[PDB]
Every structure is written in structure tokens, then in C-alpha cells.
Amino acid sequence: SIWLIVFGVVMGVIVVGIVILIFTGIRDR
Amino acid sequence: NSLQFVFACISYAVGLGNVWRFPYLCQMYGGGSFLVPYIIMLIVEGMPLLYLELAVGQRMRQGSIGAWRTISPYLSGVGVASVVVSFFLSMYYNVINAWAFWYLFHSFQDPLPWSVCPLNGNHTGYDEECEKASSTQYFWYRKTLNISPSLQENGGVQWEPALCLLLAWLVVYLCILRGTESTGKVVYFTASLPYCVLIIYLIRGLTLHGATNGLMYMFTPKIEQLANPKAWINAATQIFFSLGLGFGSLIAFASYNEPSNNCQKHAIIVSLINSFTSIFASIVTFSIYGFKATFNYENCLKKVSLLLTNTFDLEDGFLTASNLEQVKGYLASAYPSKYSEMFPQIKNCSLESELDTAVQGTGLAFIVYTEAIKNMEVSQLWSVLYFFMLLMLGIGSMLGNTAAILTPLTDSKIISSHLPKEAISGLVCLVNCAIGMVFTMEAGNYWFDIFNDYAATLSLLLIVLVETIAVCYVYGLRRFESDLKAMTGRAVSWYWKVMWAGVSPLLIVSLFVFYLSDYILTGTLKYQAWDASQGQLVTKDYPAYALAVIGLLVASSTMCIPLAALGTFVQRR
Numbered sequence: 001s002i003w004l005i006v007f008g009v010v011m012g013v014i015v016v017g018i019v020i021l022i023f024t025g026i027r028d029r
Numbered sequence: 030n031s032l033q034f035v036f037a038c039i040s041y042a043v044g045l046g047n048v049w050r051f052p053y054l055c056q057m058y059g060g061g062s063f064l065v066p067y068i069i070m071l072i073v074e075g076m077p078l079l080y081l082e083l084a085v086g087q088r089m090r091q092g093s094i095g096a097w098r099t100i101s102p103y104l105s106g107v108g109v110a111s112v113v114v115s116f117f118l119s120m121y122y123n124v125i126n127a128w129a130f131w132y133l134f135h136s137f138q139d140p141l142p143w144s145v146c147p148l149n150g151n152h153t154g155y156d157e158e159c160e161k162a163s164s165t166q167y168f169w170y171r172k173t174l175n176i177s178p179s180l181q182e183n184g185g186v187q188w189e190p191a192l193c194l195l196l197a198w199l200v201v202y203l204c205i206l207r208g209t210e211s212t213g214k215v216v217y218f219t220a221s222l223p224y225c226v227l228i229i230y231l232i233r234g235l236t237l238h239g240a241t242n243g244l245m246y247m248f249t250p251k252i253e254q255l256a257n258p259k260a261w262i263n264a265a266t267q268i269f270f271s272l273g274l275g276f277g278s279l280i281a282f283a284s285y286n287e288p289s290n291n292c293q294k295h296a297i298i299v300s301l302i303n304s305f306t307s308i309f310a311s312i313v314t315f316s317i318y319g320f321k322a323t324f325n326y327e328n329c330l331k332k333v334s335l336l337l338t339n340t341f342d343l344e345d346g347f348l349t350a351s352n353l354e355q356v357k358g359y360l361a362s363a364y365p366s367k368y369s370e371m372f373p374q375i376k377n378c379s380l381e382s383e384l385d386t387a388v389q390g391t392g393l394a395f396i397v398y399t400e401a402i403k404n405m406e407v408s409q410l411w412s413v414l415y416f417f418m419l420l421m422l423g424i425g426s427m428l429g430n431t432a433a434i435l436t437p438l439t440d441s442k443i444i445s446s447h448l449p450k451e452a453i454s455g456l457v458c459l460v461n462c463a464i465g466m467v468f469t470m471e472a473g474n475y476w477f478d479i480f481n482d483y484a485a486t487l488s489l490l491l492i493v494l495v496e497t498i499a500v501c502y503v504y505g506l507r508r509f510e511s512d513l514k515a516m517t518g519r520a521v522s523w524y525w526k527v528m529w530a531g532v533s534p535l536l537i538v539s540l541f542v543f544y545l546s547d548y549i550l551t552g553t554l555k556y557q558a559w560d561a562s563q564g565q566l567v568t569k570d571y572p573a574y575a576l577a578v579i580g581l582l583v584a585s586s587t588m589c590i591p592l593a594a595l596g597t598f599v600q601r602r
């Protein structure tokens with residue numbers, strides 16, 4: 001199913017973005 | 030500084046209430062019969078109260094709770110309630126975004142899912158429900174929601190909508206964490222892309238066969254259904270929900286503006302731009318809807334002609350739509366014995382009935398625009414563009430709403446001294462996403478219907494009524510006018526004073542009285558439910574447990590005001 005592949009890619013990139021932003025914010029403070 | 034504030038207010042106001050909610054609200058309540066009150070309710074309710082909110086944000090120069098607490102302590106509750114409503118909004122609004130995500134992900138396929146019905150099972154025809162309804166309607170009601178036939182019947186949590194809602198909430202949380210003041214180029218971009226996409230769909234939407242039927246249905250003010258109090262109620266509540274009145278974040282936005290600014294120009298411009306965007310989006314939607322209605326009418330006429338021709342052994346092209354009644358009379362006069370058998374079977378179809386009952390419900394925008402996409406050349410590109418514009422609008426509106434939710438929480442030193450703001454926002458998003466899973470069930474569309482019509486509908490009227498009475502009578506309109514004149518050099522116009530003091534509260538009270546009287550007289554609250562066997566929408570009475578939630582959603586937010594007054598009186602005594 002192509003919709004599942006696209007959703008997996010999008011969710012992966014969004015989760016990596018959230019993780020990096022939280023980690024950078026915590027490390028800065 | 031004017032451009033920044035004006036575009037911030039526009040970006041807050043222009044969202045899914047303009048592109049998604051307005052079209053189906055207009056369709057449900059008669060088209061023109063809903064548009065005439067809307068405009069009537071915009072001059073009286075929209076502009077004066079939006080200006081009052083923007084002025085209260087400036088003369089106080091505090092937050093919503095701070096302002097309504099500084100005017101008088103006995104009133105501080107209206108600052109708390111204005112948060113709670115936002116909560117309920119953020120509880121269900123995201124579901125819409127989720128749906129768009131779904132419709133985006135099913136847009137990279139050559140055989141678009143809403144374009145071709147599945148095979149029946151013989152591999153010789155189409156599905157019964159997919160044929161009785163449209164392919165777009167079948168995709169929306171079965172492939173997307175899998176809607177249960179009644180509210181009493183619900184299954185488990187559908188995992189695909191749950192994942193889409195989880196993804197939408199993750200995107201909202203990422204947008205919360207990432208940016209707060211970098212909207213510089215975004216305001217140059219996110220404000221023109223919806224208009225460009227609507228322009229493209231208008232260029233397609235006004236050249237379809239029978240596009241004028243949709244516009245005529247839209248702009249005809251039928252007097253017979255213009256007397257419905259529910260139409261006026263829905264118009265006023267949609268105005269309040271689209272301008273953001275009662276949510277309390279407009280006061281916060283205006284709190285950061287200079288006191289030597291013209292809030293009479295800005296309020297007028299924002300309200301007019303919101304109205305124009307709603308009208309334009311609804312015009313495009315109703316042009317496509319009229320094309321759908323014309324196609325359904327032509328299909329019914331063709332089916333009836335084929336039925337008569339296959340039986341009376343008429344010529345192939347002899348029986349057309351321009352000579353249908355005359356040939357029917359001729360055939361009936363020829364011999365009645367044969368005509369008697371199928372007379373029940375011959376169906377009457379007209380443009381009007383199709384226009385009322387072609388497509389209706391909260392999925393009107395999705396169904397209509399998927400239909401329009403399936404009639405394009407490169408359907409994939411236009412589907413991506415439209416469902417990306419919708420995603421931007423929803424994400425922006427939710428950023429505004431969640432900022433309104435979170436600012437009181439961050440400003441509270443009790444919570445801010447224990448957990449980081451990055452964790453407070455995460456907890457808020459997690460609670461909202463976990464509670465919003467009730468909209469992903471099989472019967473979740475009915476709960477979405479309940480929340481879209483009662484969570485932030487009448488409470489927005491009562492909050493604004495209390496706010497305007499507070500500003501005019503408790504604080505003193507003369508004192509407020511003097512303060513505003515000293516702040517900006519110009520005294521408030523007499524028209525704005527008239528609309529603040531008497532006209533808007535009286536109209537709100539009259540609307541509330543009419544709605545209550547209509548509900549009492551009817552005594553049976555009903556909702557639309559999908560019927561796959563009949564392939565349309567039927568009206569069913571709300572069950573006993575559905576009225577409790579409906580009552581509580583309004584009651585908590587509205588009654589949060591009197592309870593605070595009682596608590597303050599107890600504290601004093």
C-alpha cells in the first residue's frame with residue numbers, strides 16, 4: 001500500500017525532527 | 030507594525046472554518062437562506078464585537094484572564110472559560126487535519142481510490158453501495174471513516190484514522206517546538222497559496238457542465254426556509270467561530286499592539302477579508318456541487334429513458350430528455366396494461382431535490398473537491414496541491430488555538446517551576462491526542478458531529494455576551510470611551526457605541542431565546558446518519574447518553590463563569 005509507505009516516511013521525518021529539537025533545546029539550557 | 034498585526038489576525042482567522050465549515054453549513058440550511066443571515070449577522074455581530082475585543086486587548090494591555098480579572102474580580106471566570114472552549118476545539122479540530130492527511134496519502138496512485146468503484150464480486154459490475162452513492166461518497170463514508178449505521182453501534186478504534194490523527198498531532202507539536210517568530214516569509218507565502226489554489230479550482234469549477242445551477246442554488250434566498258431559527262443560530266455561531274471571538278487569543282494578540290493605533294480600520298479589514306475568503310471558497314465548492322447535482326439529474330433521466338426504451342422497443346435515440354413527458358403520455362395512451370406494471374418503477378427526478386440531497390454533511394468539502402479532482406487532467410498534482418493548502422490552513426489555525434490554550438499554562442509560575450515548557454506542551458498534546466481517539470471509532474463521525482455543533486457553538490455566544498455586558502455596563506462605557514480616546518486621540522464612533530451597548534447583546538439574547546423555544550417545541554433532537562443500503566442520509570433521534578455529552582460540553586464552559594462569581598462571593602464572606 002503506497003499510502004502506508006508515504007505515511008511511514010512522513011511520520012519518521014516528523015519524529016526525528018521533534019527528537020532533535022527537544023534534544024537541542026534541553027542541551028542549550 | 031500594522032502589517033504584522035493584520036497578517037497575524039488574518040492567519041489566525043482564515044482556517045478550516047472558512048474553507049470547510051462554511052460550505053456545508055450553507056448547503057445544510059438552504060444556501061441563500063443561510064447566506065442572507067450571515068451577512069446580516071456580520072454587520073451586527075462580527076465587526077462590533079471583534080472591534081470590542083481588539084480594544085479591550087489594548088486598553089488593558091493584559092491577557093484574557095488578566096483583563097477580565099482587572100475589570101472586576103467577580104468576572105475572572107470568563108477568562109478561564111475562554112480557555113476551556115479552546116480545549117474542546119483543539120480536541121476535535123485536529124481530526125479534520127487528520128482526514129486531509131489521509132486524503133493526501135491516497136493521492137499518489139494512478140487509479141485514484143475515489144475515482145473508480147471496486148468490483149462487485151462477479152467481476153462484471155460495481156458494488157451496490159458504491160453505485161447507489163458516488164465513488165467519492167463511498168470512499169469518504171466507507172473507505173475513510175467506515176461509518177456505522179447508527180450512533181448506538183460502534184466498534185473499536187480504527188487504526189488508520191488513529192495513525193493519521195497521531196501524525197497530525199506530531200506535526201502540530203513539531204510546529205510548536207520549532208518556530209514562534211519566524212513567520213516573516215510564511216506570512217508572504219501562507220496567505221497567498223490558499224487563494225491561488227481556490228483560484229485554480231474556480232477556473233476549473235466555473236467551466237463544468239451545470240456550474241450555474243450550483244451558483245443559483247447558492248444565491249437564491251428561499252423565503253420558506255429563511256424562517257428557520259437554526260439557520261440564524263448557525264450563521265451567528267459560524268461568524269463567531271471563524272473570527273475567533275470568545276476564544277480569548279484575539280485579546281492577547283491585540284495586547285502586544287501600540288495604543289496609538291487604529292483598531293477601527295484593522296477590525297473592519299479583518300472581518301471583511303474573512304467574509305470574502307469564506308464567500309469565495311463556498312462559491313467554488315458550490316459550483317462543483319452544482320455540477321454534481323446536474324450530473325445526477327442527467328443520469329436519472331438517462332436511466333429512465335433506457336428503462337422505457339428497453340421495454341417499449343423504441344428507437345435507440347428516440348427517447349430524449351426534451352420529449353420525455355410527451356412520449357410517456359403517448360405510450361400510456363397506446364396501451365395501459367403494459368404501462369401499469371412498471372409505473373412504480375419509473376422514478377421522478379428534478380434538479381431541485383438533487384440540489385438539496387446530492388451531498389450533505391461534514392464531509393461536503395472533501396467529497397466535492399475529490400469529485401472535482403477526478404475530473405482534472407493530472408489529478409494527482411491538483412489533489413496534492415489542494416490537500417496541502419488545507420493542511421497549511423488547519424495547521425496554522427491549530428497553532429493559534431494551542432497557543433491560546435498554552436499561554437495561561439506557561440504564565441502560571443506554579444507549573445512553570447516544575448516542568449519545562451517543552452514538557453508542558455508535550456503533555457497537553459498527548460492528552461488532546463489520547464482523548465481525540467473517540468473520533469476515530471466506527472461511530473466516531475457522530476461524535477465529531479456532536480462536537481462540531483455544540484463544543485464551541487453556543488458557548489462562544491454566551492462568553493461574548495458576558496464580555497460585552499462587562500465592558501459596557503460594569504466597567505462603564507463612558508470611562509472606556511474616555512480611556513480609548515486618550516489612547517488613540519480619536520473618540521469611538523457613535524455607531525460602534527450603539528452596536529456595543531444595546532444592539533449586539535439584544536440580538537444574541539433574541540437568538541438564544543428563539544433557539545431554546547424551537548428546541549422545546551420540537552422536543553426531538555435529530556442527527557444525520559449514513560444509510561448504505563439506501564446510500565444516502567437519514568434522520569435519527571439522539572440516544573439518551575448522547576444528550577448528556579451535548580449538554581455537558583456547553584454547560585461546563587458556560588457555567589464556568591457563575592461558579593467563579595459564587596466562589597469569589599464565598600471568599601469575600
Ligand SMILES: *[C@@H]1O[C@H](CO)[C@@H](O)[C@H](O)[C@H]1NC(C)=O
Pocket residue numbers: 149151
Ligand atoms: C452477480 O452477482 C449477483 C449478486 O450481487 C448475483 O445475484 C448474480 O446472479 C451474479 N451474476 C451472475 C451472472 O452470476
Ligand SMILES: *[C@@H]1O[C@H](CO)[C@@H](O)[C@H](O)[C@H]1NC(C)=O
Pocket residue numbers: 372373374375376377
Ligand atoms: C412519481 O410521480 C408519480 C406521479 O406524481 C407518483 O405517483 C409516484 O409515486 C412518484 N414516485 C415514483 C417512484 O414513481
Ligand SMILES: O=C(O)[C@@H]1CCCCN1
Pocket residue numbers: 041042043044045046047270271272273276426430
Ligand atoms: O477559521 C478557522 O478555521 C479558525 C478556527 C479557530 C478560530 C479561528 N478561526
Ligand SMILES: [Cl-]
Pocket residue numbers: 046047051267268271303304307
Ligand atoms: Cl466565515
